[PDB]
């Protein structure tokens, strides 16, 4: 059995822009096993309406998943994507950078 | 360059609290379209690309029911492979496969898959010649003698180089317009200064399909090892995908900086420049 540490991107689906609605995306890959926990924050608050993809994997067989919600930037809000997983001690936080 | 329908699967159990997770995916090229996910009440095969909504009802209940038979399969290999390795009784295993078919532009089969993988690790594949088995230990070699006792193989290899083409061909035929359709990257160049004598230049590649994708730097036409970060492709979302390369620069010196972008949706290799 091996164990694989999640990678995690956070990033918007279009180039961002103050005012004009968009999509918050946190990629978790490269990750094993499955069981993972996944979090969109909103200035350290878990967002709701958090969808994601169905479970996938590549072909080292490491999983990766998409966790994605509506959004629209603002020159005062901060976002950021929050990681929970076996191989982690404690939650892993990766804030979201508008040039990445 | 070949089209390719694969189908993936997870099979995790979960000792003590039930029956284990099943989560099954297929795709077609880099595109999903249909999911099973046993975690349901009544859960069914169910579709995840427009085009393959126009499936009949016979589909969907025969989908439906195939992804119910590969389950009890799965659950019975999560328990015969704890015993090949001599494993308590506690204690969740993952058990994933995935297999199918690349259509040759000659119109017939350029190469099958059926692989597998037991807690992150190989087990079993089928060999390229679509013949024999390849074991990763003597588990596995357990498996292959049985396999080969029932010539799997070959009736496998029957279903790769007939039913998986021609599904792979329908699909490819009623999704036409986006599987068959290369979205060229949209492509640009950022600045970001890191200090008074050096910046970031960083190369984007933004909604492109398929998801493959090469994107190097070069200064003065050599290409770039050092002081670099690409990312690895990302999905946007919406069936495209997205990378970047980032280069840290001399101030004053950009313009000796060029990212080179290739893709299917380009007829040409792109070069590209931070233009200010
Ligand atoms: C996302 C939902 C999944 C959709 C439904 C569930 C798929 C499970 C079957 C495995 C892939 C296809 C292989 C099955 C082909 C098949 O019939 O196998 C003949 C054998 O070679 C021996 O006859
Ligand atoms: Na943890």
């Given at each position: 059995?091996?164990?694989?540490?999640?990678?995690?991107?956070?990033?918007?689906?279009?180039?961002?822009?103050?005012?004009?609605?968009?999509?918050?995306?946190?990629?978790?890959?490269?990750?094993?096993?499955?069981?993972?926990?996944?979090?969109l924050?909103?200035?350290?608050?878990?967002?709701?309406?958090?969808?994601?993809?169905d479970?996938?994997?590549?072909?080292?067989?490491?999983?990766?998943?998409?966790?994605?919600?509506e959004?629209?930037?603002?020159?005062?809000?901060?976002?950021?994507?929050?990681?929970?997983?076996?191989?982690?001690?404690?939650?892993?936080?990766?804030?979201?950078?508008?040039?990445? | 360059?070949?089209?390719?329908?694969?189908?993936?699967?997870?099979?995790?159990?979960?000792?003590?609290?039930?029956?284990?997770?099943?989560?099954?995916?297929?795709?077609?090229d880099?595109?999903?379209?249909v999911?099973?996910?046993?975690?349901?009440?009544?859960?069914?095969?169910?579709?995840?690309?427009?085009?393959?909504?126009?499936?009949?009802?016979?589909?969907?209940?025969?989908?439906?029911?195939?992804?119910?038979?590969r389950?009890?399969?799965?659950?019975?290999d999560?328990?015969?492979?704890?015993?090949?390795?001599?494993?308590?009784?506690?204690?969740?295993?993952?058990?994933?496969?995935?297999?199918?078919?690349?259509?040759?532009?000659?119109?017939?089969?350029?190469?099958?898959?059926?692989?597998?993988?037991?807690?992150?690790?190989?087990?079993?594949?089928?060999?390229?010649?679509?013949?024999?088995?390849?074991?990763?230990?003597?588990?596995?070699?357990?498996?292959?003698?049985?396999?080969?006792?029932?010539?799997?193989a070959?009736?496998?290899?029957?279903?790769l180089?007939?039913?998986?083409?021609?599904?792979?061909?329908?699909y490819?035929?009623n999704?036409?317009?986006?599987?068959?359709?290369?979205?060229?990257?949209?492509?640009?160049?950022?600045?970001?200064?890191?200090?008074?004598?050096?910046?970031?230049?960083?190369?984007?590649?933004?909604?492109?399909?398929?998801?493959?994708?090469?994107?190097?730097?070069?200064?003065?036409?050599?290409?770039?090892?050092?002081?670099?970060?690409?990312?690895?492709?990302?999905?946007?979302?919406?069936?495209?995908?997205?990378?970047?390369?980032?280069?840290?620069?001399?101030?004053?010196?950009?313009?000796?900086?060029?990212?080179?972008?290739?893709?299917?949706?380009?007829?040409?290799?792109?070069?590209?420049?931070?233009?200010?």
């Amino acid at each position: 059995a091996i164990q694989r540490t999640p990678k995690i991107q956070v990033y918007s689906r279009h180039p961002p822009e103050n005012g004009k609605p968009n999509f918050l995306n946190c990629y978790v890959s490269g990750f094993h096993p499955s069981d993972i926990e996944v979090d969109l924050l909103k200035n350290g608050e878990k967002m709701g309406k958090v969808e994601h993809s169905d479970l996938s994997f590549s072909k080292d067989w490491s999983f990766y998943l998409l966790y994605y919600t509506e959004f629209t930037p603002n020159e005062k809000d901060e976002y950021a994507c929050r990681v929970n997983h076996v191989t982690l001690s404690g939650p892993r936080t990766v804030k979201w950078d508008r040039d990445m | 360059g070949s089209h390719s329908l694969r189908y993936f699967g997870t099979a995790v159990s979960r000792p003590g609290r039930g029956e284990p997770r099943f989560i099954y995916v297929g795709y077609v090229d880099d595109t999903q379209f249909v999911r099973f996910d046993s975690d349901a009440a009544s859960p069914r095969t169910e579709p995840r690309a427009p085009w393959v909504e126009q499936e009949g009802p016979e589909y969907w209940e025969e989908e439906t029911r195939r992804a119910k038979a590969r389950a009890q399969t799965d659950r019975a290999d999560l328990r015969t492979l704890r015993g090949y390795y001599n494993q308590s009784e506690a204690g969740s295993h993952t058990l994933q496969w995935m297999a199918g078919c690349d259509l040759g532009p000659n119109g017939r089969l350029l190469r099958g898959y059926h692989q597998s993988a037991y807690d992150g690790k190989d087990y079993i594949a089928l060999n390229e010649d679509l013949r024999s088995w390849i074991a990763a230990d003597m588990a596995a070699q357990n498996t292959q003698r049985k396999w080969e006792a029932t010539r799997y193989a070959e009736r496998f290899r029957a279903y790769l180089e007939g039913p998986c083409l021609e599904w792979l061909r329908r699909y490819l035929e009623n999704g036409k317009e986006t599987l068959q359709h290369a979205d060229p990257p949209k492509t640009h160049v950022t600045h970001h200064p890191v200090s008074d004598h050096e910046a970031t230049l960083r190369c984007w590649a933004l909604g492109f399909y398929p998801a493959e994708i090469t994107l190097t730097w070069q200064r003065d036409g050599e290409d770039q090892t050092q002081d670099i970060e690409f990312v690895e492709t990302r999905p946007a979302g919406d069936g495209t995908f997205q990378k970047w390369g980032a280069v840290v620069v001399p101030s004053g010196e950009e313009q000796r900086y060029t990212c080179h972008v290739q893709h299917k949706g380009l007829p040409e290799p792109l070069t590209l420049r931070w233009e200010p």
